[PDB]
Amino acid sequence: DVDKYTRARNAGGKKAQDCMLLAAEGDSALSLLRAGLTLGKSNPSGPSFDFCGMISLGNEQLTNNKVLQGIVQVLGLDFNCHYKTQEERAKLRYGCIVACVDQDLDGCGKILGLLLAYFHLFWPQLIVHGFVKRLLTPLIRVYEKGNTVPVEFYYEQEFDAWAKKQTSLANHTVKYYKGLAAHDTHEVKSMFKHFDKMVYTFTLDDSAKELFHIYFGGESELRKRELCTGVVPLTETQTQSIHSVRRIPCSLHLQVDTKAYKLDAIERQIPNFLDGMTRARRKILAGGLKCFASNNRERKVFQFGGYVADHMFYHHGDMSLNTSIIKAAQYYPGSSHLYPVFIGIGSFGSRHLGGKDAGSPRYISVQLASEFIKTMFPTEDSWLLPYVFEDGQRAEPEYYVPVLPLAIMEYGANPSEGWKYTTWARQLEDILALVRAYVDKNNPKHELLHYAIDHKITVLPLRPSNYNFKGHLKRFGQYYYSYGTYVVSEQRNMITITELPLRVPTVAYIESIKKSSNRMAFIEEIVDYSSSETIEILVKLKPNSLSRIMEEFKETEEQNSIENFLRLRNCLHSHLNFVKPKGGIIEFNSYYEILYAWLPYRRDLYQKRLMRERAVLKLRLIMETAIVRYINESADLNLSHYEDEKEAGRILSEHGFPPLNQSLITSPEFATIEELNQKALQGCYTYILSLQARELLIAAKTRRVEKIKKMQARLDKVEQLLQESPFPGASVWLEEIDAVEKAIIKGRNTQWKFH
Amino acid sequence: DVDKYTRARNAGGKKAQDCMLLAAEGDSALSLLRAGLTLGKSNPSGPSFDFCGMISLGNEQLTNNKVLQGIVQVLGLDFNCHYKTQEERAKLRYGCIVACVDQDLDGCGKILGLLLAYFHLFWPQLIVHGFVKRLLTPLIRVYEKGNTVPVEFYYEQEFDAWAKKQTSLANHTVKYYKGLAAHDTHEVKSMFKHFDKMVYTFTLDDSAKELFHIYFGGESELRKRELCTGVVPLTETQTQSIHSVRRIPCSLHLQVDTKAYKLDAIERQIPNFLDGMTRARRKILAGGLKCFASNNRERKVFQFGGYVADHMFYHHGDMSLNTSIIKAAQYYPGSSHLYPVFIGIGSFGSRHLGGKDAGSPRYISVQLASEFIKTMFPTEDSWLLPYVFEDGQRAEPEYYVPVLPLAIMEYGANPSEGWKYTTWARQLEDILALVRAYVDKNNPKHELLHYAIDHKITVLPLRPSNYNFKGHLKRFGQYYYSYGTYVVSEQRNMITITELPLRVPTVAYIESIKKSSNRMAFIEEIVDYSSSETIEILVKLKPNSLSRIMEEFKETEEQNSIENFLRLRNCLHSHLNFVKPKGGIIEFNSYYEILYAWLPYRRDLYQKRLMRERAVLKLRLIMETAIVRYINESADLNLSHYEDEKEAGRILSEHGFPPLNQSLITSPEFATIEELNQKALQGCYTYILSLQARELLIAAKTRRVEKIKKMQARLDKVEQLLQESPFPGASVWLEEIDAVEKAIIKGRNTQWKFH
């Protein structure tokens, strides 16, 4: 077999039942297992090569794979045995096979799930009676400073419960070990001390079998139904039951690990319907917001990609990161981004190659479209979004909620086969009219739009956008078609294609025309004299070929003879599969329902921002009233730093000064509403104990009083902003819509350069 | 026919001589050319498709090259015919061919030099009289915010000469355009407005055929000899002549750009002999120092690579960066780095796979040593090294000069074949003794070693290091051999290998043994029961077979029969090829030559560092004395901060108060001695006007006088530290050597973990 197999000393012998075969995922896991097994030979008594062999991993096609062939060869497994009896199972060369895989979505999920599916399909009785086992390593380890002994959790839920049970984590360092290679040598020896406690068994409950037909079977219909609901994390009772007897039911593993892996794989191609961007593009947008927040100077594409990888935890390949950055910065007729989030200083590609003619990342530079991004992705709303956490560190948000539905007003296609997704940008005017009717409460269609929302029918048009399109858009039999424009000169027997169909690359169109032999039977030659953004394809035909073209290619009342011959028609087939914000997959059938689903999320975000702003304003005015009421009697109490700052708190508590938490009321970063109003109090008097002498003079007092009157006016303004007729925060939504419309118009005027 | 050829309207007709062909390397340059050529009604009478065609640049092999075949087909060139006469030169379909290429050692030199060599080899008469032309786009553009028209320099020397005057850059922005894709649309149209004057014609002067043969011919000895001197940039006179006549000689073009490209390609594999690291490794070290100069917290490999790319201008791929980071963080018996610059938390590989079994960059984390680096690479000297400026921004230094020569005490190899380079680490004790004898001046061999370095003979041993090696290092006459250790038991017929030769991967060695069919005629089986760091490989042989190995593999007075059978000897072949600090390539016959070459550079760096320290200490001393005198007798003129206008400057210049550059003196980053002393007295009086009230009484005067006393003591310590008998700064070098030896000992004791 392969040389990756390290045989145990007693493997296949009289004591083969006591032997176990560790199946590491890759070379790093193999090296870790080797190091642990060899260090166990000297200090402890336990695992070693005497009773532990090592191997590495690498239906109709699952039987010819070399790795499974090697595994079945070493284990001595017989296909036609079914291992029902104990003596039949005793003939195996190893007592059990232990899978040692990384805790991430690659090791657990895809590979562990694949091994479990293979075993269940071929030898289902092996999973029962406890033959297939796994290695459960500490997923999270928290180290207390000056304690040199960590506390370990095998699941994120246990760590979250312990953390919320804890008072503070100032002196605790949390390390996430998603992969086996992340364990240090001392950590590895700590695991191999009680290696016997890290072996978990699979039970193969009744519900597992059907699941094995869903995630890994050839049935691709019920798989989508299973995937369209998101992954539910394991509950605490299930984890406790698993840890009690060290047995993991297969069902739970299939429903959690493999399902999360499949969802992650889908999310890398299909974007969320709230912002129209995938996880990688969300990371890029967040990194651009973080980098150009205060500087906004042009940076090289590779430099910005390095910044994104450093700060936004983009652990994928840098070539994909650079390609996605270029795609986000591309702006041309037929581009995938109608409103790009980045301004591209340099040659970022043209419509002829479909954006593939972009310059190298080391030459072209990128900048943040500050005006458009700020008007569409407000900085205030960024705090209230739910964020993803990579190894306990903040990263890009789970989803962005722009002022207008970005998943609709921009083009989008998935080139990777496996899941169909195609979106054609709708007209900006129609989107603006629809949202303004929904929010304005003064539009005559506002009540009609609400009627259309509660019961699903269409009341306002939603036509495909034709901003950078010089052709025609014809709706025939519920299908939209884009037609390019051409001219014919009979005297020179020549045709000049002036406009290709929507999102059709020039070189791709030319090669498609050239491939068809029948088309070339009349075309003498083709050249491409098109400009950087316009289309001018010069085709010269053979003599007396126009009549032959007319008689051969026939008009179908939709496209004339020339358009059919020149392939100047495109069908706007759109696949509206999107990723739910909670994790699931949702398949729409029209853009109207996409907009109807996006509206409540934006409305709820506006309401949440309004309540958070109201609470923050109340807290700020409370602390300002406290500081001014200390100021006007500073000649009565006279204690800021005159005495020791430990006896002051008694006298400030004897008077009416509530404890407050500075740096939380002064600048709440991500303080959620209930936590913000809970932990704002029970702080300390640093807002009074640690003030400066600058506040002593009356000018500071009058500045404070004008500030407090300003925030009182703002508080009443946001209070009347609430309980509005359509919903709280509708007027501010209308103002943001107007601002983003102005920004879009300005960008369109200056070719998305903004001077 | 040709895939990416856009024919001109008049090409191949009565105006062929007026038609020119633009050759582009990639699709980005083609898109730029298409955008420039299609300015209709804007930039009139400029280039267009009427007289400009386009083509893309996608010794028997040169004949069948598809790109060159397309080019010759387009131009109608004839291989047999020599275009020496004007009448036969008019048969070409284009008047001239223009190369529109980048200016970053790839567009220029690599493929432009290739095109020039092709034309010279096949049609040398074409280059003369003018046929091959190039597009010299503005390399550097200086924009003034109040002028909105840039100043363009086509060479870096011109920009440097301009920057010699116009010193302030008070309101100027410098932009570097190394590639064609870096130009913006307005820049593109401005360039195409003068496209007629942007073209430069090659001349093929004398002494260029020999240069062409050297750089592109099959001969390599003279090509290597050319590369031992480095690239010399064009002088002002040559650039002025080129710009005045708009003709570029081929020789100058070659020696300027293709030599630089070849040197850059070489130095990406061959490291410098001063620090023992290539450009990528030096960038990694500088980025690590920048990242962990303050925190030293462990970071993921991919995050650190992103930081390095963002800050150190590492524009290459991220996989190479991650691999190099892992290699720099690897520490195991046989690893390349005996003293790694990085502490790696996780599994970074093992000796078995030669470091190729490391975990993914997502999981394993890296951090700076912060204890060995601070001693081997002092932070004081980091301000004195020459620095590499990429696109006008600072980057990793030109070369590092460590306290001990790292190119001689670390294993090095070149995985990229094309330039042999192999280094075997010398013993640390021998190197320390040699350097101490050279420096301490008290060693009995000090003057003897000076005589030795003067007469290039060897007087102190330099033996290969055997720190992490349990074998034997034996010298058999002008070569060294490493022998592994084995134990063989005749009973039960097993041979257990306990130590492999130096830098021999375990799995590679096992595979090499396995491929030898004759050796497995006796080997029953091979098992790899080795540990993580020590090797224990079991080889079970066939019964009564040891005598067969005795009679088959014969003793050669160097290898035992078992050693020859198991290939337990390795020859320590050395290839002492390095790159000169100025750019050239140097070859050494022994490690003694490397040490003797590295010593003067380090001695001169100590002298320069001490000189700069003395100068900056004198500057600080005069500024402190000035401020002390001001705080002493300010009552005479004025004691307040109200004098912040020019009146204070005038009243201070009336007395003996010199104007000093406070910012430069208080923190000179890279100010060398000459302009340090030139700009010291060209500052302002801010060193006095920036005195807070705290510093306006005696309580700060005592601190000031204590500071001046301490720095005066440091000043005369530097003073008599100089003029030492061996060289100035000998004791500082000795104590730095002791500190670095202590750090190395601590790292070796802690397995390069430092707890």
UniProtKB/TrEMBL annotation, chains A, B:
Query: Which catalytic reaction applies to this protein?
Result: ATP-dependent breakage, passage and rejoining of double-stranded DNA
MF-aspect GO terms: ATP binding; DNA binding; DNA topoisomerase type II (double strand cut, ATP-hydrolyzing) activity; metal ion binding
Alphabetically ordered keywords of this record: ATP-binding, DNA-binding, Host cytoplasm, Isomerase, Magnesium, Metal-binding, Nucleotide-binding, Topoisomerase
Q: Does the keyword Isomerase apply?
A: yes
Q: Which cofactor does it need?
A: Ca(2+); Mn(2+); Mg(2+)
Q: Name one GO biological process term.
A: sister chromatid segregation
* Any one Gene Ontology cellular component term annotated for this protein: host cell cytoplasm
Q: Which residues form the active site?
A: 363
Any idea of its EC number?
5.6.2.2
The residue ranges of the Topo IIA-type catalytic domain are 270-737
Report the sequence similarity comment from the record.
Answer: Belongs to the type II topoisomerase family.
The name this protein carries in UniProt is: DNA topoisomerase 2
Tell me the organism: African swine fever virus
Native organism taxonomy: Viruses, Varidnaviria, Bamfordvirae, Nucleocytoviricota, Pokkesviricetes
Parent-protein residues present: 414 to 1192 of 1192
